[PDB]
Curated annotation (Swiss-Prot), chains A, B:
GO biological process: carbohydrate transport; cell chemotaxis; detection of maltose stimulus; DNA damage response; maltodextrin transmembrane transport; maltose transport
Coiled coil: none
Disulfide bonds: none
Keywords attached to this entry: Periplasm, Signal, Sugar transport, Transport
This protein's name: Maltose/maltodextrin-binding periplasmic protein
Domain of life: Bacteria
InterPro entries: Maltose/Cyclodextrin-bd (IPR006060), SBP (IPR006059), SBP_1_CS (IPR006061)
Pfam family, one: SBP_bac_1
Lineage: Bacteria, Pseudomonadati, Pseudomonadota, Gammaproteobacteria, Enterobacterales
Length: 371, 371
């Protein structure tokens, strides 16, 4: 299983508009004769570094920009070469997210942030605070509904609450991240995680809730709210739930702070098709018609391409996404991010079960993240 | 020992221009017949709450604004009553420092921040970084000079270094301080204190250095630098040392962050002379001629009175003071500040001696500050 010259294989996560991307691929193939294959492997963010290290894997890998620093450090990504005219077509802050050691290591596609999604038929006025959700849940629970269900298995989803009162990954300083200053066991993080664990131990939420269960619950009107990204909107559209996308609730009077991801496309350093990959990404995908094809499948969020974003920006769901993004922080792209996510994922799982105390769980995560 | 009606007794710290203040007092006495006594007791910030609690003490107490929240909470201070025309004469941010629970509890006099003071004859180009001071000290040490001497006994002086990399007292949030989020044992504080302790353990500085020794050393040219406030300048003037006042050095590429104090004048709630005290403070002291009398004795810093500050602002020493102030933080005035200072004072003393480790010292301070 190697990489053939003269074809493109693209990996993208299963929650994104891979069929729409495949349509852009088929258009490229029709115009050029170059076959484009789109796959969505499980755990692609882990599989890529394993297969790319041996010189194999996809020609193009899509993921949020946070994983890309580590890929690039491991020599798995090729420096990309858009010209000044091309770079001008995307927002500068999107290029920042994909710059690593003064080198662009991927094409930015779209800016993603979690929002609060609520059922307007159940909940005309969404809660402004996390604090009021317990009582709302009790009130709803007959009705026979619940207030809030979202993916508790991945720290991406729980982090906005953890960060609200002060939790953080790595301290941003002299333009760089102090990788020895990790903010996962400070009082803010502890306050956030404690509230979350309390909701679970009091059966306002279930520790086993994952993406699939929460999506089912919201999309069939069993729960009044969920937390998710723009990729989720099209299934809600199909469900016919009358939904709103809004600012996340506050905690201790402060904004929830989602970690902002820029979906990005990197080129496998081991690919003999670097020129083709550049041509596809710049002149097929990163175009109004190309982004529209993907977006129509699953919404991308706020696209990096100025010309198309100017249209999407009029959508109140996009406005809410960017409001939530502004209240959160851009993810760092440093290689240490992988250890951070792993550390936080374990801490949340362990605390939610009652296995470890919040304090003990976060103490452990702090140590793991920082070494 | 009680408080007589028809006289004013003022307490002010011994490092301030108490003789100049006494001159303003004698002017008031000449105009009105009201005797004004100025004293500078030792540990006046501790003695005041002890004596004022029993209904005794000075009619007017001067200290930086940080102690005043606790005084006011204990019912020891009278709400002051300047009118809108008077309030307009001082800078709004100075009034903020003396507001406690929506009530003004003192008259602001001047804004104080520490600066780096250096001997231009020994050291034409002052170090920009804390990191370069060890090597400079070795180079100077014959010569037979030292690089830096400043008061190590009081945390006021060591805090700017401790805060540089992230240390903090109480987290500022919804306009209020989260009194359960104390930042004295995070990685930044630990990094700061560790560097300080290293300088001491390596004999670049002496753990026993206090205000008096450091002032002697600088003012007689034995050390190239000191850290101090504007009140110190007049003795340096007299010493004839060719000195500069400049931005504090950075640590880990970040500004030293001095805690900014607003010298303030409160009225003892137990005083039968509240009207007289108001009259003296508003119409004698807080005037160009009144502040000038004090300033001429020992410089006040950047005065709260707009009209006089517009003159003082042209002094590069004042510019440097305000540059350092802008890089630091205004002290909170909450009652918890007293526990904070006590906690940090002990931690620094204990670590500097080698009694406790930096980690153990700050762990202990963290607990004490937050309870
Ligand atoms: O949960 C940790 C996880 O968070 C992010 O993954 C997101 C991704 O950015 C979104 O595009 C969407 O697919 O949901 C994912 C969460 O399941 C980080 O990008 C990822 O590295 C990290 O492991
Ligand atoms: O060292 C802790 C101490 O710091 C401040 O005291 C300063 C004061 O603000 C200055 O005016 C000058 O007099 O030096 C003092 C340090 O010795 C706080 O105001 C004080 O409450 C605190 O104890
Ligand atoms: Zn193959
Ligand atoms: Zn297809
Ligand atoms: Zn799949
Ligand atoms: Zn071009
Ligand atoms: Zn409850
Ligand atoms: Zn740092
Ligand atoms: Zn169901
Ligand atoms: Zn259904
Ligand atoms: Zn169904
Ligand atoms: Zn921010
Ligand atoms: Zn008396
Ligand atoms: Zn006198
Ligand atoms: Zn005295
Ligand atoms: Zn008036
Ligand atoms: Zn040394
Ligand atoms: Zn807080
Ligand atoms: Zn001497
Ligand atoms: Zn001398
Ligand atoms: Zn002498
Ligand atoms: Zn600041």
């Amino acid at each position: 299983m190697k990489i053939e010259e003269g074809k493109l294989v693209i990996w993208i996560n299963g929650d994104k508009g891979y069929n729409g991307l495949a349509e852009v691929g088929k258009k490229f193939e029709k115009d050029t004769g170059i076959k484009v294959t789109v796959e969505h492997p499980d755990k692609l963010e882990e599989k890529f570094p394993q297969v790319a290290a041996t010189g194999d894997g996809p020609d193009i890998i899509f993921w949020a920009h946070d994983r890309f620093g580590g890929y690039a450090q491991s020599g798995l990504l090729a420096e990309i070469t858009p010209d000044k005219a091309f770079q001008d077509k995307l927002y500068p802050f999107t290029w920042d997210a994909v710059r690593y050691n003064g080198k662009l290591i991927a094409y930015p596609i779209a800016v993603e942030a979690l929002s609060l999604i609520y059922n307007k038929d159940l909940l005309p006025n969404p809660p402004k605070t996390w604090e009021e959700i317990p009582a709302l849940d009790k009130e709803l629970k007959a009705k026979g509904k619940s207030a809030l269900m979202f993916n508790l298995q991945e720290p991406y989803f729980t982090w906005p609450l953890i960060a609200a009162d002060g939790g953080y990954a790595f301290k941003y300083e002299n333009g760089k991240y102090d990788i020895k200053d990790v903010g996962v066991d400070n009082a803010g993080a502890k306050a956030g995680l404690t509230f979350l664990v309390d909701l679970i131990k009091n059966k306002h939420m279930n520790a086993d809730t994952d993406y699939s269960i929460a999506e089912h619950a919201f999309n069939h009107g069993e729960t009044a709210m969920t937390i998710n990204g723009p990729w989720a909107w099209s299934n809600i559209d199909t469900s016919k739930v009358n939904y709103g996308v809004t600012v996340l609730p506050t905690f201790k009077g402060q904004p929830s702070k989602p970690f902002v991801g820029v979906l990005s496309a990197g080129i496998n350093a081991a690919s003999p098709n670097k020129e083709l990959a550049k041509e596809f990404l710049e002149n097929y995908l990163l175009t109004d018609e190309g982004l529209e094809a993907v977006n129509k499948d699953k919404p991308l969020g706020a696209v990096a391409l100025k010309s198309y974003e100017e249209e999407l920006a009029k959508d109140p769901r996009i406005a809410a996404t960017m409001e939530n993004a502004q209240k959160g922080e851009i993810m760092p792209n440093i290689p240490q991010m992988s250890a951070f996510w792993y550390a936080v994922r374990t801490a949340v799982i362990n605390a939610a079960s009652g296995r470890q105390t919040v304090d003990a769980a976060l103490a452990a995560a702090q140590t793991n993240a920082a070494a």
